Amino acid sequence: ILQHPDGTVLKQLQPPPRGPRELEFYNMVYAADCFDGVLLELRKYLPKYYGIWSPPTAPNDLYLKLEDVTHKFNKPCIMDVKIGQKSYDPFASSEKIQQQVSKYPLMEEIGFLVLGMRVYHVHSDSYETENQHYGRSLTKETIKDGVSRFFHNGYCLRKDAVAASIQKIEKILQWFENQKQLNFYASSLLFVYEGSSGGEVEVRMIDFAHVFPSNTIDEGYVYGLKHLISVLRSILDN
Ligand SMILES: O=c1cc(-c2ccc(O)c(O)c2)oc2cc(O)cc(O)c12
């Protein structure tokens, strides 16, 4: 992810087949002649898409030009959470499935995985970061406190940001309960709140290299969103 001063990001296509699939997902959803109500509503929850981009002298080098969802914030606190029971897609080989499950074997049980976080601390005027090994260390016993850490700043637990995140996730959950045409594997939610209010909170769906046509409810995604909502709700009682 390359942050651009004009409030966009450039996301380089992943190697094939993943990058090409993500490009086609954004192209399908943001097609100018699309009047599918399901896809028009989905646009609200994604970063705005500005099309494929490549450097003027390098047509080989492929990026997606996307809205930087952190751009309106002064000291953005950012958390990325992978959603679902399965990180592997319906056409994964046995080895691929094993690779994905071994990255975090609690995915089926918990339904989400914290990929990372960046939290502004007011007392020190500094950021605390967690990498992928943080989230992969969390279990049923530690997931509540693991998620809570994201909302520790301003000398307090930011229950305003927690409640706002629940309210934003609930709209995404409602979209998922009103569509049976896409299933999403290894996709994420990006959470942003203001570290420097309820509060400017942003919750956006990202990472679409494993989105497939479906005939059913995305049950794993729904389970993960619900569990994540339940965890967030329990943090409101702290
Ligand atoms: O707007 C986006 C903003 C970010 C982002 C910005 C700053 C960070 O410190 C970070 O960890 C992620 O990451 C994205 C990643 C995406 O795949 C799509 C996006 O629109 C964004």
Side-chain angles (χ1 to χ4, degrees):
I1 294 293
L2 307 177
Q3 291 194 298
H4 214 115
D6 56 42
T8 65
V9 302
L10 295 174
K11 186 181 195 277
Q12 191 180 52
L13 267 64
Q14 293 161 278
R18 288 138 51 201
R21 285 197 306 246
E22 189 168 40
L23 174 63
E24 279 285 59
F25 176 81
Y26 279 105
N27 285 345
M28 174 197 64
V29 173
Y30 283 99
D33 64 334
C34 173
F35 304 102
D36 183 346
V38 171
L39 298 178
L40 294 183
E41 185 180 340
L42 179 56
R43 288 176 192 185
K44 293 159 187 167
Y45 309 121
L46 272 47
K48 292 186 199 185
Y49 178 56
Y50 294 101
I52 192 140
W53 184 92
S54 60
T57 57
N60 56 283
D61 194 4
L62 305 177
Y63 305 78
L64 307 174
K65 187 165 172 65
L66 295 161
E67 178 193 356
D68 184 343
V69 304
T70 71
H71 187 247
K72 69 163 190 185
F73 296 86
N74 178 227
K75 299 289 182 187
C77 300
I78 306 149
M79 179 176 62
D80 193 5
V81 188
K82 189 187 280 176
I83 306 300
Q85 293 182 287
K86 305 181 197 325
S87 197
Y88 51 90
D89 67 40
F91 302 98
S93 61
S94 297
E95 290 76 19
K96 188 83 230 74
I97 291 158
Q98 194 172 267
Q99 193 197 306
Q100 288 298 311
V101 177
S102 64
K103 293 284 181 179
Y104 189 59
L106 285 159
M107 199 73 181
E108 196 84 55
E109 177 156 34
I110 300 187
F112 65 88
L113 169 60
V114 175
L115 296 179
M117 71 182 60
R118 175 172 181 76
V119 187
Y120 180 74
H121 290 266
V122 173
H123 57 258
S124 46
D125 187 21
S126 62
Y127 283 98
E128 202 95 40
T129 64
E130 302 296 340
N131 61 36
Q132 294 182 54
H133 291 131
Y134 177 80
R136 288 172 46 189
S137 290
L138 301 176
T139 67
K140 272 196 78 215
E141 197 168 337
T142 61
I143 194 62
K144 178 173 170 279
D145 288 331
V147 173
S148 294
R149 183 184 285 284
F150 178 51
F151 302 101
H152 290 339
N153 82 74
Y155 310 97
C156 77
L157 175 63
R158 291 287 305 278
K159 294 192 181 176
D160 64 308
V162 175
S165 296
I166 292 167
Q167 291 176 302
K168 299 290 182 89
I169 293 163
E170 174 58 26
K171 299 311 303 294
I172 294 165
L173 180 283
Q174 289 173 345
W175 180 86
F176 271 90
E177 300 199 330
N178 284 285
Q179 74 93 6
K180 308 171 57 161
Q181 67 196 254
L182 296 169
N183 286 0
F184 292 74
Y185 303 93
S187 197
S188 285
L189 293 179
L190 196 58
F191 291 82
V192 194
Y193 71 92
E194 179 57 75
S196 74
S197 55
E200 317 134 66
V201 159
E202 280 281 6
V203 183
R204 298 290 186 92
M205 299 166 58
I206 63 170
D207 299 329
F208 304 119
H210 316 262
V211 185
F212 292 82
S214 182
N215 221 312
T216 77
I217 291 297
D218 190 342
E219 308 104 338
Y221 200 98
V222 168
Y223 172 85
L225 288 184
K226 283 209 75 88
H227 194 204
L228 181 56
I229 284 162
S230 292
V231 170
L232 293 164
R233 173 61 186 85
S234 71
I235 294 168
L236 297 179
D237 301 326
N238 281 7

